Amino acid sequence: SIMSYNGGAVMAMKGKNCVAIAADRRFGIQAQMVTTDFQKIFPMGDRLYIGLAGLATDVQTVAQRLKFRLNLYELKEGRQIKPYTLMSMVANLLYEKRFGPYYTEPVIAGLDPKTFKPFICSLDLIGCPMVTDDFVVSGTCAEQMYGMCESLWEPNMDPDHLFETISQAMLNAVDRDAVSGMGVIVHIIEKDKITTRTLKARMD
Amino acid sequence: SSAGFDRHITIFSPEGRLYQVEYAFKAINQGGLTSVAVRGKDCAVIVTQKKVPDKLLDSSTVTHLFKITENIGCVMTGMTADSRSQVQRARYEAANWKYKYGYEIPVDMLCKRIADISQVYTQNAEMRPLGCCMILIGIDEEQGPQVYKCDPAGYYCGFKATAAGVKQTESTSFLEKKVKKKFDWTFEQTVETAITCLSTVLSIDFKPSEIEVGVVTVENPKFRILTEAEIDAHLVALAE
Amino acid sequence: ERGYSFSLTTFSPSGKLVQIEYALAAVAGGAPSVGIKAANGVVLATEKKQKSILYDERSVHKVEPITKHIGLVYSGMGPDYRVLVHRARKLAQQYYLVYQEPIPTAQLVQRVASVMQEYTQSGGVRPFGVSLLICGWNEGRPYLFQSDPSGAYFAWKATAMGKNYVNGKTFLEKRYNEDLELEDAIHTAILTLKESFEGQMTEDNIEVGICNEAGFRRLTPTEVKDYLAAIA
Amino acid sequence: TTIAGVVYKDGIVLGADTRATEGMVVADKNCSKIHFISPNIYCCGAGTAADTDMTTQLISSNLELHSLSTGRLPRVVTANRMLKQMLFRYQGYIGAALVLGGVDVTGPHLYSIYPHGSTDKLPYVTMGSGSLAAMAVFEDKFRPDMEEEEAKNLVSEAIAAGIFNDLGSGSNIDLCVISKNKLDFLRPYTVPNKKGTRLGRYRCEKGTTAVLTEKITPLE
Amino acid sequence: SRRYDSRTTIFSPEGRLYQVEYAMEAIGHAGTCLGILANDGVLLAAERRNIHKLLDEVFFSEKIYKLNEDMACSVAGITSDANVLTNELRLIAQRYLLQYQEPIPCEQLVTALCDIKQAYTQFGGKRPFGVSLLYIGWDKHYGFQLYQSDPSGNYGGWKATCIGNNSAAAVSMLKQDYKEGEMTLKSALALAIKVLNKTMDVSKLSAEKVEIATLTRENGKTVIRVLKQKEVEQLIKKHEEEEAKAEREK
Amino acid sequence: TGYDLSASTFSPDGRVFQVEYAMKAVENSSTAIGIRCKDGVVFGVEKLVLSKLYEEGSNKRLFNVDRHVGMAVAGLLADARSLADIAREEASNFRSNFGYNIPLKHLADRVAMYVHAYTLYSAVRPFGCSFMLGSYSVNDGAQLYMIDPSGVSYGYWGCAIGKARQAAKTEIEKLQMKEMTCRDIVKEVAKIIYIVHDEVKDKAFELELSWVGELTNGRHEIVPKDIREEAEKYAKESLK
Amino acid sequence: SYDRAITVFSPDGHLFQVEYAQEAVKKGSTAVGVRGRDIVVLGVEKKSVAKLQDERTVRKICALDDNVCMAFAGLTADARIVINRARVECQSHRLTVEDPVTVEYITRYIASLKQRYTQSNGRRPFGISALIVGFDFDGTPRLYQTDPSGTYHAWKANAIGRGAKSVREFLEKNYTDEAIETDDLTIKLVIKALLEVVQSGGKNIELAVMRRDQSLKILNPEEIEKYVAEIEKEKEENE
Amino acid sequence: YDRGVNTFSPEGRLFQVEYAIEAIKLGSTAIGIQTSEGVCLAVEKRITSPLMEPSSIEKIVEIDAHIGCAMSGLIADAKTLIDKARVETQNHWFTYNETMTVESVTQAVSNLALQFGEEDSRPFGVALLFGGVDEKGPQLFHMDPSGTFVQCDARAIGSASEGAQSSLQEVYHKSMTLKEAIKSSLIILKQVMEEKLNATNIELATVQPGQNFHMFTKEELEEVIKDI
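^ inputs. structure came back:
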């Protein structure tokens, strides 16, 4: 499959009053190392991010095309976009090609423009919506990602244990499969302020 | 008030009046056709007459009445050139309605289509505005009787007592105080006043062969083209 | 067909459009219309009177709401009113496909006036004499908007349209102060309906829609006689 | 992913589960496959979720503009004709499994939606991979012209029976009740399948995680 | 069928396009705008068309519209006919961001709109654009860029611009107070205030009847600032108060 | 001025003179008629010969559509061939989708759509051609129809076109619509057309004949003029 | 699309709104040019600048290539279209036949495109003209002209715009084959031309020079005063 | 009364086309001569100023190898017809492998001469002089803007057209040779030229089977000038 070329796992773990998202730093081809610089998470709008896992062309395509539609939205009316309209906007573009569909695993981690309510969603390449308050992940390993959330993650968590849990999550899970590694970048956002942390893996 | 070609095309005057379709209002008087419609409680009646140049006139082509569907039917006025084409457009709208939607047509949306069609042709003056007047009846459940008339101005309106044509100003003005009041409407009562309103301007009391009279009552909802036999029975019934 | 589509309506020596001046003259000779944005919601009244007793208000309506939460009134001809309403209903889906959410008030005015202003530069005829009044309730504060043929739209609490639109508005300027409620808006709507009356205070000579933050509510003339019988 | 229902005497009762996953791995226990159409009609999704949602949004689009223009309650066959026409044009390219039902003034109507567009009227229909045991419980235990309460018990037992049988059926139970004077969408209902408590505490603490760079971005 | 069109495109016996004259009259009627010199900032001033106090004015900026985050433009002309160009140029600047993922220097953007503005002129006898608009913003090269659009297709861009017949009296005041850096944003505030005081016939120069906007360069913000009426009130009051100190020469 | 120029633009009287200019243009054409008995429909046309002008049998106004339907035209000859060819190939569409004969009543609706549409658009003009349509069949019967430049679809048991029209069809009422046998009515109408449409103005003329009905079993062709010479076998003694 | 007759042929021998649109070029600002074996020069006046703002962007001379200089007259809009259209041509001739654009190839494009732009209906002719100044490959010079009908012709010197007969009569001193033996004599020739053509002077004068492969340079308002100093002093030296 | 621009005349003919036929009378003067040794021709460049460069103005062009052409009145529209017809001469060499015949240039140009129409665009005022030598020997051909083609032993266009042909009718004969055709034509050319004869006033255009192309070369025309 094409999803085994670039790979990548975007882990968005929501806390109590805040939402966090994390992704691997490594960008390369299969097991051959290239560079850790490329970040698969991109900032979109104000107090909102999006994770992407898949073909880097479609990843940057969603980055530039969402920036297109979002700029038209914010430049028409100055109101900040709501996450529900954003998800319907993402599922719209992914459904525009039924027989031509691109390869991506969009994961949106954002806040509420009006209030402190966080948001999480993970859609397939055809834009299958999932709206929950717990967590959203898209990546390679099926057993490891959701398995660490079942073994650790709880509905009510503070940012201290949120980063520590997602740390060992990105450790005991991502390090299982060699296609993702070489460091992990973490983005935790809340109405108060935005915080960004990073991690480290083996350099082999 | 007129700038350039304004007099010959459709735009708005200083008062905003259209020059072309006001000629279409006097485009009805060609032929001298007068169609009156009286819709009663359970029934709706149409009455119209004809002109006969000579005996070579065919009795099959006499009928000026049109039938949209088996339930609903129509009557036209003015120049017959625009009426036959506009009726064929109603055939296309009714056939496409049952096709894609697959249920009974309210006859209100059909009058919405024709109202916009004659309006869209009034928009651009490089095609003929089609000033023909569109008059129908209707049959629909829970709404009782239905009669709708699509005027060439691009809007649709119709009710119990409604009519359009050259002499309908006189007759319907008499029908103002004559109809209601309280007057109850039966079959022979609605057809009687359909004759009396014709007797206001004409009062010829000619044999039934000349009139084109449709009537639709709700027992079997299907509208039926009338035969001169039953009208002759109603003609001797209205003579006291 | 021909397909000329040329712009034939052109600039006057003063710079304005004489055809649009004829359009505003069709609005100035239009039927009396008024609406009031106050507090919770917006109230629409205007007037409808048949040419004779042969017509009734139970079937054909001069006021058809654009959405369940968004109503609309207007001045001028009905045929072109239902035309721009038909385009407004279609355009509502072009919005709803991407958003999957209802639509803000001004969001209609932006795209409707854009198509209307496009229809000016475009060939054939123009916006004609239909000046539409768009209202609705969103984000907790409702809105009342009106545009013109040239596409210029403004926001306010209340206005008068059609004939005697200046006299009725000067009466609404002294009556309307601070904020008003739905009952008070309907009350002074009877006052501006009694301006050109004719048919005020009678349920069959007018139609009253009302916008609310819970969504637009269209009441039959029965409720128009309820509140006003007994008027004021 | 199983949708089924039965039409009782005075109305229609439908049901669905929330379970949509892939394989034996537990992923999403909560999913809403019952989608809005209009006050008189609901819809139950299956197969591909995103494609059937865009289809039910176009059907709700056509019924929104038409019912608003007509001002009356449309018939179920009005959307069924466009449903069977659009899916027939693709000849089954987009997999579509839906339950089309509703109660109008003419009474209840039920139509089975297939990717080819073939629709037949039945008192009860079962769609999805859990349609085997559901049809078996229905066909065996069904009697015509049941009341609303007995239909709720039949739908509850039929959907709960297909849970264990089918591989992808389970988690929450959704109820859909359609009638002339009442419209009931009841979610959730009952969750027979769960997952127990953790065997031990792996809960993380500070000092075992090395942080390279911690960036602070104040807002406002 | 050739006599219906008025030949707005076709040349005129005067040796030039005849409709462009009436186009310059369309913008030259009721349109009131200006520009201020750019030194570490820039500001904008216009006239509010609304004389009705009952209006809501919930749309924030009235005559000024924001095409880009760091770059906006003043506009003068028919509202909706300008609003078509607002979203059009906004999409042209958006398709440039869709290309390079980087903002748009105003130079090639203004010339692109000029190539669009000549469309109605050069074919079909179409009605030319009755809207002439200004340009403001900032770029990595020339810093603050203040340009001007003309119906003839030229970009008449200056750091001090004039729009309208009433503002034509300010050009003499612009060159009378003319300086370069030197001028503070505050000095340009009093400069444009005296511009309206000389041009606009409103008694006492009411602050709520005229539109004022500013712009600043911040890293990496570069905010286009819509201002509350509080600072404009005290600005024009402090302005004519400084003029009360400028009449002491007698 | 010039309210009559464009066909899409009305006039203060409520019509367009382009149709009226085309109407009286057909009046300059020679005799074009039709008559239908119970056994068939008789057709005839009078050819006007200016000088020689050419060989006999060339470019006759009598045309054909299908085996059961044919054209007798009037007015401009080229546009007559145009609408004749359009109605000629139009029957092939009904023959392709179905495979039986096209009803003449609804075949005139097509020409009604063509002529009316050409009056709708301002770019094109109305056609200055009229014509007669008639036919007979065992499963259909005798239907004669008349279409003019105004796009009117109508018919009579008999009709006339050209200079002498109302005076030519007056005495035709002596010939019955049913009881008469169109085989003998060939020479019966031949005596009328020979006497009427006065030839004292232009002495050189010629006469054509055709027929359709049951005797030919729904076949429309020319009843032979060279056989029995039924045209002048009688009418030579009718005027004296 | 849009169907209509731009201009029709009159028995007088020419069209109306095309040949009369030459007045749109005749009413434009004065523009001239001089080719040379060493350095090529040109000039323009009547800038009508406010002098208080930045006029650098209204410049009437652009470059498709460093060796190609565009000198035009008339309104700016059609000039900018001539710029971008010739940019598509010079770039297409950059892609195909990599070597730079010859003057006959660009004049054929600009002139014949305008001609076929006057041919098809629904296209209004440009109200502008232009004349090319530059250096052909292998050191040869170039100058040509453009017509509203799209005809190109090469002169010895370029005098056009307002007062074309006045400056051409002033070229009586330019007919000397000794001009220009040096670049200083070429700029002195433009100095005498710009002083005579037309209203001038000291501010609105705008020009530039290019010598061989060296790119064109626009001198600041400093040496321009020096060339105007020695040109004005030459009248005192001629006594 | 401007109607449709395509309207006929009551005499009659096309309005706009006949107006352009009168517009040919202001063009340059060019005279071709048909001679068994070859088809010659010449034109007056009509110097508008002493600054004029001689090689920039040419009224004669070369279509095919042995086929030449001339222009009249308006230029650029004819210049487009020149190279556009050359594409059809190369497409002629595609299938037929040989040079296009001089008579077939009529079908290659005059057929497409006026295609103009309002929909799917304006006529031309230029008349062409077709020189060349086909397999049958020298041929001189001429066409009008309307597409009407005629074979002429000598044809003049532009200003001197009526005057040059009226004077040249006497000097032309079936025995005219090449050198005689050149020096007897420049007598008319020096009569129909306003400026004093020089190398920049007129150019020669010749086509011969054995000497080509040629066309003609400069500095030889000056040798014929001293032979005036």
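Chain F has six helices and nine strands. The beta strands of chain F are 32-36, 40-48, 62-66, 69-75, 129-135, 143-147, 158-161, 205-213, 219-221.
thumbs up if we can close this ticket
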